[PDB]
Design a protein around this ligand. Structure first.
Ligand SMILES: *C(=O)[C@@H](NC(=O)Cc1ccccc1)[C@@H]1N[C@@H](C(=O)O)C(C)(C)S1
Length: 265
């Protein structure tokens, strides 16, 4: 049974003052404590370019198909010329029309944010329209795939609240089977990009999450277990001038602020 949302007004005001004083940054964030109900929403409902954070919803859709016998973990996926994308990933250096186990592809999509792997999954699951429908079914309202990855131009959309609320659902054991849930959380704890939200956590805390960076937007979303027994979900997105370190630093500062507040409470 999940407590009622209970906004920490004072922490929320502090965070609001911190984001608003940064010229040329536009930030949105949502945190929810599963034990206390403590919430923070500073622009958490606003729509952002998703960047790679969209790979987290695609992962859930993947495992949904597995659960429903529509995809198998071991079946061979083809890296067709038309699925090959630049930027992050290792699959792009392999021979065109070589093949990979579906689970290997799904893992690469998340752990190293492989854009080729991602377009292979989007294709395997029936395309952008099909996935968009699924996202709406889960209550994601502004989570929308418009173009293939890496989508440098920022056309694919989501919201901090969408990303956190899906993770809350998964955390509480909704949508996916037990086995698929536990696989997804394992995968999400082995990403190589841990410089945003995890950088604000204290010693011994763990986090399942997924980052995104297209230069003009940086973000991160997932779920934190604190050594005191507490759990919360977290999502933050920042619009910035191209590669501005201040955008990434802001995410660390807000992560730190929230983590420390929950230790006190
Ligand atoms: C998703 O946003 C992806 N971004 C890109 O491919 C563009 C890019 C930007 C900077 C360096 C390399 C590639 C992938 N996800 C982000 C992320 O998870 O933060 C990466 C930087 C890993 S690439």
């Amino acid at each position: 049974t999940l407590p009622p949302e209970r906004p920490l007004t004072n922490l929320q005001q502090q965070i609001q003052q911190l984001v608003s004083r940064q010229p040329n940054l536009t930030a949105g964030l949502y945190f929810f404590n599963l034990d206390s109900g403590a919430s923070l929403n500073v622009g958490g409902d606003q729509v952002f370019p998703a960047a790679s954070t969209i790979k987290f919803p695609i992962l859930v859709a993947f495992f949904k198909a597995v659960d429903e016998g529509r995809v198998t973990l071991q079946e061979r996926l083809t890296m067709r010329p038309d699925l090959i994308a630049p930027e992050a990933g290792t699959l792009q250096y392999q021979k065109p029309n070589s093949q990979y186990a579906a689970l290997e592809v799904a893992e690469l999509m998340i752990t190293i944010s492989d854009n080729t792997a991602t377009n292979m999954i989007i294709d395997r699951l029936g395309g952008a329209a099909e996935l968009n429908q699924q996202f709406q079914e889960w209550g994601l309202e502004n989570t929308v795939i418009n173009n293939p990855l890496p989508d440098m131009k920022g056309t694919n959309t989501t919201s901090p609240r969408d990303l956190a609320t899906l993770m809350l659902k998964i955390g509480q054991g909704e949508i996916l089977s037990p086995r698929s849930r536990d696989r997804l959380l394992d995968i999400m704890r082995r990403t190589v990009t841990n410089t945003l939200l995890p950088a604000g956590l204290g010693k011994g805390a763990t986090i399942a999450h997924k980052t995104g960076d297209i230069g003009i937007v940086v973000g991160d979303a997932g779920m934190v277990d604190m050594p005191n027994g507490q759990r919360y979900v977290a999502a933050m997105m920042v619009k910035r001038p191209y590669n501005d370190p201040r955008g990434s630093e802001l995410i660390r500062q807000v992560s730190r602020m929230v983590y420390q507040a929950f230790e006190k409470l």
